[PDB]
Design a protein around this nucleic acid. Sequence first.
DNA 1: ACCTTAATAACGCCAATAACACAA
DNA 2: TTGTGTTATTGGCGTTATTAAGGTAACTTGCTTAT
Lengths: 52, 52, 470, 104
Amino acid sequence: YRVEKGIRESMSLVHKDKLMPKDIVNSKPITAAIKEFFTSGALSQFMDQDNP
Amino acid sequence: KKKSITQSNELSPGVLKTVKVFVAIKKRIQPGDKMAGRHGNKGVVSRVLPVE
Amino acid sequence: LKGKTSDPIRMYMREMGIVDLLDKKGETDIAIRIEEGTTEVFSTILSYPIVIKTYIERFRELEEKAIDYMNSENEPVARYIRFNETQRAYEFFTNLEKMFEEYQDKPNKKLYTKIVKEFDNLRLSTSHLQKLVDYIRLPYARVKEFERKILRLCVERSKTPRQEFIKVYKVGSLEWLEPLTKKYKFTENTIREIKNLTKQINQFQILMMMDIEELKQVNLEISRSEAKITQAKKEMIEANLRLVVSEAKKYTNRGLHFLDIIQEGNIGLMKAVDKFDYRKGFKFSTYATWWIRQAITRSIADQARTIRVPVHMIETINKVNRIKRQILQEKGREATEEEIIEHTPNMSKEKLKKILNISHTPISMESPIGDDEDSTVGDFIEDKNNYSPIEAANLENLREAIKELIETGLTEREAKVLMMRFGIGMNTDHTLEEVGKQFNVTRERIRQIEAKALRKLKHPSRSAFLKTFL
Amino acid sequence: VVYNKDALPNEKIVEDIREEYVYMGDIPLMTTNGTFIINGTERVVVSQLHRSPGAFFSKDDSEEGAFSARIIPYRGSWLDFEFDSKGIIWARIDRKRKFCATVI
DNA sequence: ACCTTAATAACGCCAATAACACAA
DNA sequence: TTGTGTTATTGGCGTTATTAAGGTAACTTGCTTAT
């Protein structure tokens, strides 16, 4: 959602010749969300490792 | 073994050097620990009597 | 509708989009309106004598502050007076001075027209114009100060009439308070004071012109013209409030919430409207977004943090950030600072070792810690700059120790000397030449006495015991 | 892909014949035993039990016939349709003024 | 996001001066 | 005990690196952010 919403605006700064389809795509709002859910969510606690 | 960041991490900028130390110690049971059989019974070790 | 809704943003948006968007025709119409208003107030200013002589006097101040330079190959540059008129400026000023001399001496009509036309030649936008309107106003301000003051000084003493104002109010007289001998205000000190103030009043008028009605009406006409201009600019700015909100949608979460963003925008707009002349056929919308953007980004850089940070250090950080993203989404690898600098206008290799060391907004002390034994950060910070009741008990055990150690030394003398020369229960820790006078003698062997005391104190009879405290 | 891009005069038909494998992000994989190593710390993501999406009819019976309904969505805002003592079919959107259901 | 300028407070300087020391 | 040598500081000086201020004129006009 976030990255595509940003995509519809990274086309409003055209300055290039034969633009390639790589300058458009962004990455951050994907990892900075996955990683957060993994590192702060209530449903991810240390594995209680007393014994098997 | 050398494809690290020449110091094994991004170091979270601001940090010069760090070291990890690992210490191990045996522990024996003593008056105060807590034993419990599998059948829901439990208690605290109260004394230790000589063999005889 | 006015239906109890509390959050202000709606209560502002409602009124905001009320009045209609306008077209270039209306824009240029209200623009020429403000322009002719300004020319009205301008023209009506310089029709008074002292204005130009004070102008010339300020030029004389710039002349002396220019002569203050060769004391340290042109006329010394300072043109903060006029905008977009120095040899031409100086020469024009010389003509102004001399022709104004002839003006104040001989003529009635002609040379006044000459000076107003050579002023028509000049160009000043809003700064110096306001400088001149204050040139006129401030005198009226000060004389009204003195009027209010003489009132407050006499009216709440002089029988407290407060309604016979028409009799007393005749100003610049100093001929009314003498019957006050046979009236109230037994105010001799006040008498010489109000005479001093009226002296200064007549003196200000002498500097300027005849009585208060020589300036009251000037200020009235100025107020009227300025109100016309103000209404024009208000109508202008009220027409494009929506431009602000439209542009302010990009910067929405960079650190500031929306309302203050909008306010900074409106500042940067209101500042934009008066320096945009219709003389060029263009669109107000084009030029004004520049100022909107300047204001919004400046305010963001200003108050986006608790620990404030200068603005250049922030734009450089933004530049580093854009470079870092560009390379990450191009070569996969992350930092390779060799590359960060290998193509960068930063032109340094150490600032980077500091420009990103300030990259952590302070955590807040009231963040719970999830499970983590159910606590928060705000109860792990502890007092560090005080003396724990042990750190302040191993002191009196020494503060009193030597206070006794010395009591088994000299009879009295070396005690006095060590106290005076080190400072113990004293107030200053006096110096050699002070003890030198304390005993009327021994300007030099006082040092010998202290050396003897110290060599007498470093004996295991007295030394090693204290050695613990270090 | 693009073209002249006039007022639909063969708008996007002719240009941009290339494509590449853009980078997207990072995906944390699980070991063979069902754990994740996050910053070098074995973590486990316990499952979650939650109500199902559909229609649920109940009756908070501090009344008679105080039926209700719910259209539980997988993501969004959930409607309802409550009754009264007399028989009115109200309607609310997750919380609101109680407006009659015939409005929809 | 980029400049083009005054303006300010930290930093290096070598002399002055008040103070300290060290041989008879 | 009085002479000749430091020194420790301390206001002055300049220097400049750092901060604050200001200005662009192709046209651009109203979220609501989510048990």
